[PDB]
Amino acid sequence: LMPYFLLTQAVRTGNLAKFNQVLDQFGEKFQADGTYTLIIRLRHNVIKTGVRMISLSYSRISLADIAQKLQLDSPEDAEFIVAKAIRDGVIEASINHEKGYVQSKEMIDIYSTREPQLAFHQRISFCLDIHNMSVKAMRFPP
């Protein structure tokens, strides 16, 4: 996995130069495994990774600030990138270009809602099914 370790380091650092040099150095292993289409969709989701980290560690950051942090060209480009990230649901936030800032969803206390019920329902049904399978598989050979 060392080539992929280098790839992950390059993407996390967000540096196209290191990403490209890693790709050029370890293309052979990438032919052997088969990821090139995935490894360019990578570059795409590398800028996506930048925006996702920004939205993960912020609540009301402005478009100019997003652009500066991601080293994008203009707040216009940053606005496009973040809006598409919203569309793809990788940051799961809102946006507001009246004042040019991306707002995040108002985090809600997720225990007075049906998500705990749904999770416990899945797990309860799974446990019931396991018990039924076990008590069925119980066999008596004569």
Binding site: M53, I54, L56, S57, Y58, S59, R60, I61, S62, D65, K99, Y101, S104, M107, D109, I110, Y111, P116, A119, R123, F126, C127, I130, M133, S134, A137
Partner: protein, 194 residues
């Protein structure tokens, strides 16, 4: 474990062949600060007779420890910088200075935010004796890494504190532990039913 052993053997240090008592006490202080919560730290270091006795001779280690304990954060970063230099020079801690400084910075940030629901970045920067860009960058890095329970808000610089409620934390822990146990149960059942 280093904190546990060092604090258990601090009052009866006999191994002078490794290091003098002063160096051993500095190691105990550093490791205890990075490993122990605030209550245990106060009970076993700030209120430690044999540690205070040597910290009288050691005026910088004392300033470090008490700057952290008494929530004096500018002095704390000063002491942490000097500790980073000392402990880079050190030979046993040498491959730990970056990690230790990072963890102590995270501890200081969590400690400051532990008693706040919404802390303005200006106040945080003034408290830590740094700029606003510095605190913003550090907070963003540690929140992204998942080490701090706080969300920044830069358009109007404010650091909201999204600590999880007791019941919410309990629910999340139940989900995690139950997922692990259920994976084990599923594996065992599929191994045995066939």
């Amino acid at each position: 474990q280093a904190a546990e052993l060092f604090l258990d053997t601090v009052s009866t240090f006999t191994s002078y062949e490794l290091m003098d008592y002063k160096t051993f006490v500095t190691y105990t202080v550093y490791v205890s600060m990075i490993a122990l919560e605030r209550p245990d730290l106060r009970e076993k270091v700030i209120k430690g007779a044999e540690i205070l006795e040597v910290l009288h001779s050691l005026p910088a280690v004392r300033q470090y420890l008490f700057s952290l304990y008494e929530c004096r954060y500018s002095v704390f970063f000063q002491s942490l910088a000097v500790v980073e230099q000392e402990m880079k020079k050190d030979w046993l801690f040498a491959p730990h200075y970056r990690y230790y400084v990072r963890e102590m910075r995270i501890h200081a940030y969590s400690q400051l935010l532990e008693s706040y629901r919404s802390l303005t970045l200006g106040y945080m920067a003034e408290a830590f004796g740094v700029g606003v860009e510095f605190i913003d960058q550090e907070l963003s890095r540690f929140i992204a890494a998942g080490r701090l329970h706080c969300k920044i808000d830069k358009v109007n610089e404010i650091v909201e504190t999204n600590r999880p409620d007791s019941k919410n934390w309990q629910y999340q822990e139940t989900i995690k532990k139950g997922d692990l146990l259920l994976n084990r149960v599923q594996k065992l059942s599929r191994v045995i039913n066939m």
